[PDB]
Amino acid sequence: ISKEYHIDEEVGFALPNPQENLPDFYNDWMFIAKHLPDLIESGQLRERVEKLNMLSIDHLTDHKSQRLARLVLGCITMAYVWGKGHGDVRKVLPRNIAVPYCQLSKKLELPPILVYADCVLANWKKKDPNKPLTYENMDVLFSFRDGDCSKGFFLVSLLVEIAAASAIKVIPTVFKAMQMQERDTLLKALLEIASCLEKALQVFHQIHDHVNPKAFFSVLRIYLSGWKGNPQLSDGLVYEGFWEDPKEFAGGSAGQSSVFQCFDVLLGIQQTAGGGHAAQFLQDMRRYMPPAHRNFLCSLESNPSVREFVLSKGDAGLREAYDACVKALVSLRSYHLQIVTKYILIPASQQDLMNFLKTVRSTTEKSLLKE
Numbered sequence: 089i090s091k092e093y094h095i096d097e098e099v100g101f102a103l104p105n106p107q108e109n110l111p112d113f114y115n116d117w118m119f120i121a122k123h124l125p126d127l128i129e130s131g132q133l134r135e136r137v138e139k140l141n142m143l144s145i146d147h148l149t150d151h152k153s154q155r156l157a158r159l160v161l162g163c164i165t166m167a168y169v170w171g172k173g174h175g176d177v178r179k180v181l182p183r184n185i186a187v188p189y190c191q192l193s194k195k196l197e198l199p200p201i202l203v204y205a206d207c208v209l210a211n212w213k214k215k216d217p218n219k220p221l222t223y224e225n226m227d228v229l230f231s232f233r234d235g236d237c238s239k240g241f242f243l244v245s246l247l248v249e250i251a252a253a254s255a256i257k258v259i260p261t262v263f264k265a266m267q268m269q270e271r272d273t274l275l276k277a278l279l280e281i282a283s284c285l286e287k288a289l290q291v292f293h294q295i296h297d298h299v300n301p302k303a304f305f306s307v308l309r310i311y312l313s314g315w316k317g318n319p320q321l322s323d324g325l326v327y328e329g330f331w332e333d334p335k336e337f338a339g340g341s342a343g344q345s346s347v348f349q350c351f352d353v354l355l356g357i358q359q360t361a362g363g364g365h366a367a368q369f370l371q372d373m374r375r376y377m378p379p380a381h382r383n384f385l386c387s388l389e390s391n392p393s394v395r396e397f398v399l400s401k402g403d404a405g406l407r408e409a410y411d412a413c414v415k416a417l418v419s420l421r422s423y424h425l426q427i428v429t430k431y432i433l434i435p436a437s438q439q440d441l442m443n444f445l446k447t448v449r450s451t452t453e454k455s456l457l458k459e
């Protein structure tokens with residue numbers, strides 16, 4: 089795989105070894121982000137941010153320092169807008185944060201809001217740089233509240249992404265085998281993709297250990313929400329010294345994950361095609377991906393479909409290997425569909441989402457050939 093797509097051999101679409109510290113110039117930004125649970129609980133967060141100074145982003149050289157600052161500013165922004173998470177919101181992002189945020193967001197071709205590539209792909213570190221990438225050897229860089237289970241939610245999401253990312257290096261073999269007409273090579277490549285997607289489901293099971301439902305629903309769910317289609321910020325958020333009027337940006341979501349949209353595109357599931365509402369939502373989230381990953385999803389679409397190759401040829405061994413990749417995705421979205429009921433549907437009852445997810449699950453399951 090070419091380098092300008094920013095695909096790592098080990099962590100896939102995740103940022104390889106994200107740096108943890110900013111330069112001393114931005115030490116004031118760092119203090120608010122590193123002590124978010126304490127400043128919010130104390131009720132001194134919103135005025136600590138208001139007393140900040142205007143810091144120019146010109147001293148944030150290279151990619152990793154910009155991705156960390158975007159993670160820092162994104163977390164601060166979520167804490168300022170939502171506050172303690174009880175309904176008292178702020179509709180104006182002060183200039184001392186709003187100006188360099190959009191200014192830096194323009195340099196990375198990302199919207200000025202905390203996205204999936206921030207709080208998951210760049211929000212981690214190896215506790216021991218010598219040991220493998222296990223949950224016991226990692227930790228998040230920033231969290232919102234005490235006991236919000238953000239470390240479990242983010243690290244498990246990262247580990248599912250890394251597990252599913254080991255099948256990305258197989259994608260070049262799939263397209264080379266098609267143009268060379270190598271049935272045996274294409275056969276083995278598809279089986280390898282399904283094997284990596286089945287390991288991703290096994291990693292998904294870790295989430296029951298590190299995330300409890302009530303903490304996710306009543307705490308962490310608040311700070312991961314955006315201001316697009318949100319009644320609490322009806323017309324969006326004001327970015328002060330950058331925009332003349334409000335702006336509506338969607339909150340973080342795994343619809344912004346390039347891995348799950350890669351294999352939907354590779355397998356011809358065409359989750360973007362259809363013109364429906366769920367198809368438009370996933371095409372929208374592509375704008376929330378880093379530009380190199382946005383370009384990678386688009387390059388796969390320029391190739392002949394893997395689905396039309398297997399479909400035309402009467403090869404039962406090729407159809408079962410293709411369906412093994414499709415079935416692995418259905419197994420993910422089905423177990424994920426149980427996850428939503430445990431941490432959203434059940435906690436909400438004790439106090440459109442469902443319709444969107446099983447619309448994606450239905451489109452995937454209707455892409456099978458044998459069943």
Ligand code: HEM
Pocket residue numbers: 241244245248249292295299304340341342343345348421424427428430431432441444445448
């Ligand atoms: C931790 C590993 C997780 C992974 C790998 C994951 C994966 C995904 C993906 C790929 C999507 C886009 C739709 C589709 O392609 O399926 C999605 C959307 C969604 N997920 Fe997750 N998810 C995870 C955790 C969770 C948890 C813990 C919850 C609730 C407790 C949840 C609730 C939702 C909802 C309500 C949507 C659709 C609404 C929207 O995306 O804003 N997910 N997830």
Ligand SMILES: CC1(C)CN(c2cc(C(F)(F)F)cc3cncn23)CC[C@]12NC(=O)NC2=O
Pocket residue numbers: 203204207208242245308309310312313314339340341342343
């Ligand atoms: C639950 C949540 C509050 C957050 N969501 C989310 C966020 C992230 C992320 F970026 F933070 F890492 C990853 C992820 C995977 N699956 C769902 N994810 C989407 C759905 C959500 N957002 C909303 O607006 N309603 C909702 O239920």
